[PDB]
Amino acid sequence: KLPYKVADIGLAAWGRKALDIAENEMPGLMRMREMYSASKPLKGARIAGCLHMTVETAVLIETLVALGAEVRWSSCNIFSTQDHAAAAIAKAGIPVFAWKGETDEEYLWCIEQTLHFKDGPLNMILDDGGDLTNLIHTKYPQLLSGIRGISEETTTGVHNLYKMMSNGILKVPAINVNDSVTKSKFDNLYGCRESLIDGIKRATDVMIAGKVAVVAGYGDVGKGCAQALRGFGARVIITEIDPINALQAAMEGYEVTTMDEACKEGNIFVTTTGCVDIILGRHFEQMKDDAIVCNIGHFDVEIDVKWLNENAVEKVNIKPQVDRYWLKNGRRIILLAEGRLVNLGCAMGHPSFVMSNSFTNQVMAQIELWTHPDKYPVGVHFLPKKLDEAVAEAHLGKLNVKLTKLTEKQAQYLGMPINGPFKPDHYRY
Amino acid sequence: KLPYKVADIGLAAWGRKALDIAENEMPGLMRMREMYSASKPLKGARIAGCLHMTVETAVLIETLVALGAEVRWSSCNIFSTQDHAAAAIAKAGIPVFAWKGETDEEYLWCIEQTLHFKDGPLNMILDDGGDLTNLIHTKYPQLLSGIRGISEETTTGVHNLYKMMSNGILKVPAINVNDSVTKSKFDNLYGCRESLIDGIKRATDVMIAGKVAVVAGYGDVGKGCAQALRGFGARVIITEIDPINALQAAMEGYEVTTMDEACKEGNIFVTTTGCVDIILGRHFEQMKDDAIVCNIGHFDVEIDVKWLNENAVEKVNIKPQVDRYWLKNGRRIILLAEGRLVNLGCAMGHPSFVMSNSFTNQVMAQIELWTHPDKYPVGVHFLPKKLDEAVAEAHLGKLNVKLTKLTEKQAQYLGMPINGPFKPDHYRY
Amino acid sequence: KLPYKVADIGLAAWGRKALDIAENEMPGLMRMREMYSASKPLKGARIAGCLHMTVETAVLIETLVALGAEVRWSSCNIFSTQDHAAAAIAKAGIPVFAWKGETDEEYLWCIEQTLHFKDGPLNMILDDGGDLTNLIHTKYPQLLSGIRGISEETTTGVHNLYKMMSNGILKVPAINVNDSVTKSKFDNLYGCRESLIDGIKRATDVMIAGKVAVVAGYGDVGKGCAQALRGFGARVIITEIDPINALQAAMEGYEVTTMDEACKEGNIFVTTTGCVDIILGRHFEQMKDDAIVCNIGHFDVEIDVKWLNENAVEKVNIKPQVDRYWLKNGRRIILLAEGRLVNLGCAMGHPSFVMSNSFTNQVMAQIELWTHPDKYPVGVHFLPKKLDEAVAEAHLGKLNVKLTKLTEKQAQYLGMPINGPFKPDHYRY
Amino acid sequence: KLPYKVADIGLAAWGRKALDIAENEMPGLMRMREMYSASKPLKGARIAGCLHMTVETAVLIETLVALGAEVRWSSCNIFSTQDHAAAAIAKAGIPVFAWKGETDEEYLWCIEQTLHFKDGPLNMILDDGGDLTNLIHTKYPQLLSGIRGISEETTTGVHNLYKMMSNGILKVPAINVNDSVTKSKFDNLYGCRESLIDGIKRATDVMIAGKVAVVAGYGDVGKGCAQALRGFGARVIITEIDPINALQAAMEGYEVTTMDEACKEGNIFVTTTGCVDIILGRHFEQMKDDAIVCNIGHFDVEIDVKWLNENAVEKVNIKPQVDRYWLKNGRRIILLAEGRLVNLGCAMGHPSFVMSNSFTNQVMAQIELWTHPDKYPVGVHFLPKKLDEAVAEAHLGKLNVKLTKLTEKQAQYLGMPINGPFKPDHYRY
Ligand SMILES: NC(=O)c1ccc[n+]([C@@H]2O[C@H](COP(=O)([O-])OP(=O)(O)OC[C@H]3O[C@@H](n4cnc5c(N)ncnc54)[C@H](O)[C@@H]3O)[C@@H](O)[C@H]2O)c1
Ligand SMILES: NC(=O)c1ccc[n+]([C@@H]2O[C@H](COP(=O)([O-])OP(=O)(O)OC[C@H]3O[C@@H](n4cnc5c(N)ncnc54)[C@H](O)[C@@H]3O)[C@@H](O)[C@H]2O)c1
Ligand SMILES: NC(=O)c1ccc[n+]([C@@H]2O[C@H](COP(=O)([O-])OP(=O)(O)OC[C@H]3O[C@@H](n4cnc5c(N)ncnc54)[C@H](O)[C@@H]3O)[C@@H](O)[C@H]2O)c1
Ligand SMILES: NC(=O)c1ccc[n+]([C@@H]2O[C@H](COP(=O)([O-])OP(=O)(O)OC[C@H]3O[C@@H](n4cnc5c(N)ncnc54)[C@H](O)[C@@H]3O)[C@@H](O)[C@H]2O)c1
Ligand SMILES: O=c1[nH]cnc2c1ncn2[C@@H]1O[C@H](CO)[C@@H](O)[C@H]1O
Ligand SMILES: O=c1[nH]cnc2c1ncn2[C@@H]1O[C@H](CO)[C@@H](O)[C@H]1O
Ligand SMILES: O=c1[nH]cnc2c1ncn2[C@@H]1O[C@H](CO)[C@@H](O)[C@H]1O
Ligand SMILES: O=c1[nH]cnc2c1ncn2[C@@H]1O[C@H](CO)[C@@H](O)[C@H]1O
Ligand code: NA
Ligand code: NA
Ligand code: NA
Ligand code: NA
């Protein structure tokens, strides 16, 4: 029935001011507007969005609409919504169901309000984390035959997509947006490099300099976190299950040990694994007084937050999403955002510039699926490298980067199109 | 007349939460309390405090008090007070006069409230920037001979103490706390390394990576700001007048040029000079669209905000302390905190750990002035190197540092006492 | 006829001392010895090697032999051979045809002496740069039917392999060793990070701090070079044809412009493109006095060295592989190793630890091709990821890295073998 | 008696090549020549020089000479002389006594040759480490009153000048050149940042990346060595006695602990303390296999080489200045340069650019002492800040730095002369 549902529509004006500033920071999305506003390649699309409802996401949403699509939106995390952002989208006349600090039930509710449009069920999915994807496959399968495609933002979501596919249970063609190079090596890496510390700082205002910081996982996210921490004068310790990642981290000058060891040394703990059971009771019990513990992976499964609730003598809320626990042993643990995504949970997520790479990849994927479905049979697909290169290209102007153009002789020497793609498929950048 | 004036005494319970956390990050101040809470060296002291009313200052104030002093407090900047810290201090029955967003009229009023104690006038000054010092020399000279001592926090205020002495204005002994090693080369350096980005990020959420950031000045504050922005992937340009500082910046891989040049290139501008007329009209008319401009030196004379107010077509307020000016060239300038301290004005200032160095120096200074008048004629003095080292030593344990101890044979060889000082008076660290 | 041909067999003892020290640095190669010395998986193999004849290569050579193979060796660069290393191999009784400062004819000669063994023609190729591969395909095709496989070390060599294959002209199955992750993200990246500056320093002893350094190309090699230069206080400028690489470099805080621009600013120039025509006459003529110019890509085609020889007023040899040119314009250019590989040309190549990753990959490839030819039809192949992970694993012990082992529950959550591989094929690390 | 003594006068033509190059990296020294070659301020000076006989010193010597001085030279370390630099200086008709690999007997002989000029005894000392100073005070006191001045290069020698004064031993005015800002905080810092790794690499070709490097001391030399090893991916542990330096290292993300602890962890050991008994038997018996041990502080008392010589089962010489000791535990220690200066002993010392700062200070000191005796009583003096800044200014242009110029209004505001000094005497930079 409702046109939207947000925390306070009164925050619309401020949101709009924030949207204005962010647009000017997001040239990938803006170029998409220049190119495709007239031709409206998305007319007919009915896109249900499940993705952190922030200022950046607002710019993506309004890009989808300018491209002719109908869009309904919900956040993919109970803490991540930026209320002023949601307000602006709602006031603009776009159905959005999102607010900071939802309950687990308000969460599923919001998502369901994205499923039905004036003209019928949804026919495109833009998902971050697999939640909207899974909800349709298991709760509303009858809607699967009317969906042309899914595009998936984050590494956990795509992981799930692969597992669905190899189990025969995926029924809609899916583009893996996470593993666009202009996503995974930008958003995951440099985004977290700037938003992790933001989140810790806003929550706790602790000094990084002189701390021991333990980062679990050294993939794209863990790389960015580690480097951000080291940059501020923290001594950074890494844990890893993958020998290749571990050698990388050792070659960069980090000590790489087990959580079972590092729990006794760290003052700050950051989980980036995307895997269950990373920081447990046995670890909490050995930590230094006032350890800070927070997770940055997509789901809050990495930290045993239940163990704290059940086993602490004392639990004091310092403020929204900041909890201080007193244990049997007389020491305290500070826990951030109840173990959910700390950058989005306790701050404002990645900054808008890098998000423009992510969101540009999303737009192209939506066009690709909507306009070229034949290209995309049931399964999980990458964007072509030429498009990947295009998104990066689109962001060079704003940083005043001058790109070298190959001469004809050069292109022939390298046996390469003068216009790219400039790399083979297996290139790792 | 008021027993205190704050924004909201209701914020006192949160404030106390914040204080409990802070104390645990501030072993220096705590060592001071466990050492002198019994003997009460500041028995009889009446300290008037003009210094940013933050959580960190709260802990400082309570240290003073537990050491027997009576204290009355105001903030030394109009935007830097933390309301919950102020409230927690007022709730504890300590007269404080401070809130975020005072007018210039209210600012002077607050400093005035600190002059008079039930038992007569102030006999001690603790100052950051020298406004309290100037006010009593300029406007209340009859109180001068009743004041035993001044301790001064910051580069600007300490510079002013030097000018006053050499002009025969200064009528009270002063201690130069800024130029303690454990202050200048820690709080100035590492403090700003963490709190500059925090201010920019909270205000604007801009991405540092890929930007050109121009840092005016490369003293202690400049070094820290530059390193911070470098660390996140900004390309940093420095301006300097001092050939030594200039050569230092160059040897660290920073381009050094003039504002005249650099204003055409920067996306972000931080002044750190302590000097007037750093960024002017001619710089502004040449800046890239949406250039972010802010100041981190003690007073707001570095950026010609006057020029923006008189010349802009339109000033749009974004949120407290964030303004977007539209210029006659069609470009926009984002100014933070009306050109006042960005870290304190837009974030939370330095974290508590580093403030513990500065504040421990502050406490020792008060003790030295009040307990040992005879040692300090009218002039500007440094704390002894012995105490300077003590401050450092007192933060070691919290970080799990194991300092080495000279053997007798080594001490003999180096010709120093086993227990310090370990460095000649001219040592630069 | 000859058993070997080296600069001076008298350098054998010193070489052996150097080999002893390096073994202890190369656990990948040593584990290969433990595992396979008894079973001799390479008995019957007749491996012709064309790869820089350094201490590290010596350890690989003796690993091949311990694994049962017959080996004959030549260097793949006229300047790269380490004479004491070649001496040790020769004195050990292994046919080696290698010495520092060969002529272009002595070079082809050496390579040809690797082709024939006591029992017949060669049947395995271990190549770095495609030279031995190409020589057989075009000069001695009659030997192609008796070769089981090729393994290729460097990015230029594999590029060529791909071009051969898609032109129908490759006739032997080839493993791409370069693009093992434990090669490309280690050897290319961290190797050059340490050997580029080594090479510049030994040649010229210049101060990096305060210089402008221009690095052409920002792939694996360019990444390592850039970071090494920046680490010493050089201001680093990057050129690139690939938008993705360019954005990476901009996001790390480097200025990215064209050579046409950078030629006027740089004091040091490093080419890492693997492409022709990077630094030309038009560039040389605009460079600062005493610019240093050197190449680190596989072939000496990147710098127009002919243009210098033809157009300089004056050419003075400072010492082996160090040339100083005086131009028409009165300024000087310093050119390193006549434009050939500077790390190997003017120093000692990558250090032995990282080379162990490279060489371990080589050994596995040789075993793979020799022992499992059916697995490898004509074409270009990667090592399986499980083997890639094995090489990294083999190096963890020596750095005292402790790797986390997945629990059963965890492995099931991630839907992954408890033992790896832990990453999908498209992962970029 | 000899007009000079060098290893080979035949190396003079290469040496001159090296000199031509060096001069171009040393604008400070050149400025000095273009300024004073006419007026000849050192007319009548007879400077005896004891300072590492390197290319850089050659340029220094020639500057002195062109300024009218007569000069006789010896090296201040047995392994640091560069034979071609020595030869080029001897060929130019300047008495020098210096070669790489002197015995202790030859070392003292060489210093002796510098005392007597055709016109009678030396009237000026230019010293690095204080051996020339000690020798004339201890053994030739009758020459004392004939000497006008001493200028002293290094921390150790300058420390000794302080001890001699405070013991009433020092009978000549001395200038403390080390503690020039443009010296200590450049040559000590950035010099070692480049020349430490060069020494290790030339000697051993070990990989820094992934190693644990232990750095004893964290003064200016320690800071530079630590940064260098960090930059290449070593994990660096610091030891310190000074709580200030210790806290600094901690705030930069380095673990700080004791040698007693750290000797069990390090792969590489650099002493920087200037102090005796840093690495002892108990450290050696606990080190990892093939630990590399070296010293970069001025004399060789930091590592107990005596212990290794008496206790090792077997010492294998590898090449000049590289020894591998076999221990009774079966492990090996690699000692560099018999525990003497590793950068100068195993490589080429600092590059010429930074030496130009130190040497320009050296020249100004000689000018000040010789031209203005009246200004300098017996004691230890600093150069004025004005000259300190001049040195810096003189290196700016070569780096294309544009220093800003205070307007009159700013200078008035800051209360300083437009042309400096820009900093109070206590400023630490
Ligand atoms: N804005 C954000 O907060 C943000 C950004 C992007 C991605 N993510 C999420 O972050 C997580 C990681 O993303 P990524 O791109 O770095 O993925 P990734 O695949 O690169 O994985 C990180 C690493 O975790 C390691 N790991 C797994 N289990 C481990 C264990 N038990 N102990 C230690 N290490 C372990 C793996 O070896 C892997 O290298 C995912 O959940 C992803 O969706 C969050
Ligand atoms: N938390 C904070 O915000 C904080 C912390 C410490 C001090 N400060 C303030 O920051 C300012 C700088 O402090 P500092 O301790 O680094 O002082 P400093 O003297 O070490 O550094 C200031 C530098 O600015 C340079 N400079 C002066 N005028 C200039 C001009 N016109 N253009 C370019 N460079 C110029 C000077 O050469 C000097 O090197 C002072 O006002 C100080 O009180 C703020
Ligand atoms: N020991 C060594 O010296 C050593 C080590 C490994 C590789 N190599 C050689 O180094 C070269 C590069 O290796 P890599 O692994 O970094 O390869 P890479 O494919 O990562 O390429 C480097 C980059 O060069 C860029 N490029 C190409 N033409 C250009 C041009 N005209 N201007 C600017 N940029 C241009 C490409 O965009 C690419 O990103 C190859 O020749 C390789 O064989 C040498
Ligand atoms: N080119 C070169 O090789 C070069 C350059 C400059 C100076 N030096 C020499 O290097 C040495 C260090 O020089 P600096 O200028 O850094 O002096 P510094 O006083 O700044 O640093 C020495 C540091 O060592 C610490 N220390 C002393 N004894 C120690 C111990 N037992 N354990 C741990 N730490 C200890 C001291 O606290 C001090 O901080 C001196 O001998 C100096 O002459 C060599
Ligand atoms: O500010 C933001 N707005 C929207 N999405 C964001 C922001 N910051 C990070 N992510 C996204 O969150 C995913 C994990 O769920 C990441 O993959 C990232 O793309
Ligand atoms: O969090 C804080 N609380 C209180 N004072 C602070 C904080 N951060 C920085 N300063 C102080 O502000 C002065 C400049 O006016 C600096 O000298 C610094 O010590
Ligand atoms: O010290 C070395 N010994 C042998 N090969 C080396 C060394 N350093 C680098 N390379 C190799 O040279 C290739 C380019 O021809 C690189 O790919 C690298 O693996
Ligand atoms: O290349 C060089 N030539 C000459 N002296 C040098 C060089 N590098 C460092 N030092 C000098 O050696 C002293 C320690 O004995 C240092 O003070 C430094 O200035
Ligand atoms: Na954001
Ligand atoms: Na704070
Ligand atoms: Na090597
Ligand atoms: Na040198």
Residue numbers in the entry:
A (entry chain A), B (entry chain B), C (entry chain A), D (entry chain B): 4 to 432
What do the paper's sentences say?
In addition, the structure of SAHH from Mus musculus (MmSAHH) was determined in complex with inosine. Comparison of the MmSAHH structures with bound adenosine and inosine and the structure of SacSAHH suggests that the rotamer conformation is not dependent on the bound nucleoside substrate. The reason for substantial SIH degradation and synthesis by MmSAHH and PaSAHH remains yet unclear. Due to the shortened C-terminus, the archaeal enzyme structures lack hydrogen bonds, which are formed between amino acids (Lys426 and Tyr430) of one subunit with the 2´- and 3´-hydroxy groups of the adenosine moiety and the pyrophosphate of NAD+ bound in the adjacent subunit, present in MmSAHH and other mesophilic homologues. In addition, the interfaces between the monomers of the archaeal SAHHs show a cleft, when looking at the surface representation. This is not visible in eukaryotic SAHHs, such as the one from mouse; also because of the longer C-terminus that covers the cofactor. In comparison, selected eukaryotic SAHHs with a long C-terminus, such as MmSAHH tetramers (both inosine and adenosine complexes), showed an average ΔGint of −186.7 kcal mol−1. These predictions suggest that the eukaryotic SAHH tetramers display more favourable solvation free energy than the archaeal SAHH tetramers.
S-Adenosyl-l-homocysteine hydrolase (SAHH) reversibly cleaves S-adenosyl-l-homocysteine, the product of S-adenosyl-l-methionine-dependent methylation reactions. The conversion of S-adenosyl-l-homocysteine into adenosine and l-homocysteine plays an important role in the regulation of the methyl cycle. SAHH depends on the cofactor nicotinamide adenine dinucleotide in its oxidised form (NAD+), which is self-regenerated during the catalytic cycle. The protein structure of SAHHs features three domains in a monomer, the active form is usually a homotetramer.
